[PDB]
Design a protein around this ligand. Structure first.
Ligand SMILES: CNC(=O)CCN1CCc2cccc(N)c2C1
Length: 150
């Protein structure tokens, strides 16, 4: 009973989280996941500021209201070569990664590891934070508050 959470650097408090390295987070689960990081789904304005500080990914994820990919450099296989906060318009499906926003993070690029899941609750799941440099932090708990997500 195990979940990997792959996390990025924070940029103006905004970071990306993948569950088990595959698109697998619902909108409800996304909010709960950010809450476990003492974070919220970013607003568009928060994401735009993060982008301006150097944030980009090649993965769709929830923010408040939309599913997006922040892009700095044009890449043909990431958001069809777009730059800026690319907004997903048309999709059949409901499960993505998520972005999260931590107000207490540093104001610009913070490429240190994440070493805590401070607001996880009691539960049976081994949850492992996996940093891009491979650094891991594990704890037993839960973060999902909606039954349909478990
Ligand atoms: C096109 N696919 C991607 O861009 C996936 C990027 N993933 C790849 C897997 C991974 C593992 C640990 C931490 C992080 N941030 C990541 C990021």
């Amino acid at each position: 009973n195990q979940i990997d959470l792959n996390v990025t650097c924070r940029y103006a408090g905004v970071f990306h989280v993948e569950k088990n390295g595959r698109y697998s987070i619902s909108r409800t689960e996304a909010a709960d996941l950010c809450q476990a990081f003492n974070s919220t789904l970013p607003t568009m304005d928060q994401m735009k500021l993060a982008l301006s500080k150097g944030f980009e990914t090649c993965r769709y994820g929830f923010i408040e209201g939309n599913v997006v990919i922040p892009r700095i450099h044009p890449n043909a296989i990431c958001a069809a070569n777009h730059t800026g906060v690319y907004i997903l318009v048309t999709s059949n499906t409901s499960h993505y990664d998520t972005y999260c926003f931590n107000a207490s993070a540093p104001p610009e690029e913070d490429c240190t590891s994440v070493t805590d899941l401070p607001n996880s609750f009691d539960g049976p799941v081994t949850i492992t934070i996996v940093n891009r440099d491979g650094t891991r932090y594990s704890k037993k708990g839960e973060y999902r508050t909606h039954q349909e997500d478990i």
